[PDB]
């Protein structure tokens, strides 16, 4: 019935509708993105609130730090090392002293005690407490470089 | 056959109207939404900050968590013990310098031999 006229038109618009629908959905996508974002006045708020909220923690850190309420990993290392240094310095200077006191005792053929009494050398503390101190709290070795690594 | 193929053209006209009105509603809603939200170097440099800060927080609370790991009772225990040991190390230092006095000015021993025997070194000092 020369329906080519009409059966062509369907094809024409079957192309047209499709175009708009495949364009249509695109709009939807972007508007979704638009509905999922805050305005630029509210986003300007939330930021100057977060700024204050962060600055807050910077102050809390400044305080608990300045008050020595807390110990940093580097500091906890440094005290730890300084301890080794002292307990070493101690156990060392005692020894390299009492070993000379040894020779010098029988040099004069006399007890070490009275030698220390004459020269005016101090009793010391006992090693009873030193070793029980190493026991209580064990010294450890701590590299200076380790301490630099903790400080960053 | 003819009308059967005529109906398929009656479906797509209605479909086109519906799709057209839909697109209209869409462009409208965007037109209203793009009002508050407007892409700018400002809003751009802004969203980035609402993230930056947001993250910096999580970093901070991590910092805290980690900072509290360190027992200050121990820090003090250490602090006290070392004070003790250093006063003791300073004691035996004083005893060593005293043996230097006697050995040098009484037993007239060797100023070279004395150092080496006592343990006196370069930069031998009290612990401050």
Numbering used by the authors:
A (entry chain B): 79 to 230
B (entry chain A): 76 to 203
List sentences from the manuscript:
Later, Hop2 and Mnd1 were found to work together as a complex that promotes homologous chromosome pairing and DSB repair during meiosis. It greatly promotes the Dmc1- and Rad51-mediated strand exchange between the presynaptic filament and recombining double-stranded DNA (dsDNA) to form a D-loop, suggesting that this activity of Hop2–Mnd1 may be responsible for the synaptic complex formation only between homologs during meiosis. In order to provide structural information of the entire Hop2–Mnd1 complex at atomic resolution and to understand the mechanistic aspects of the Hop2–Mnd1 function, we have determined the crystal structure of full-length Hop2–Mnd1 derived from Giardia lamblia. The structure reveals that the WHDs of Hop2 and Mnd1 are closely juxtaposed via evolutionarily conserved interdomain interactions—thereby forming a joint dsDNA-interacting interface—and attached to an elongated, crescent-shaped Dmc1-binding structure.
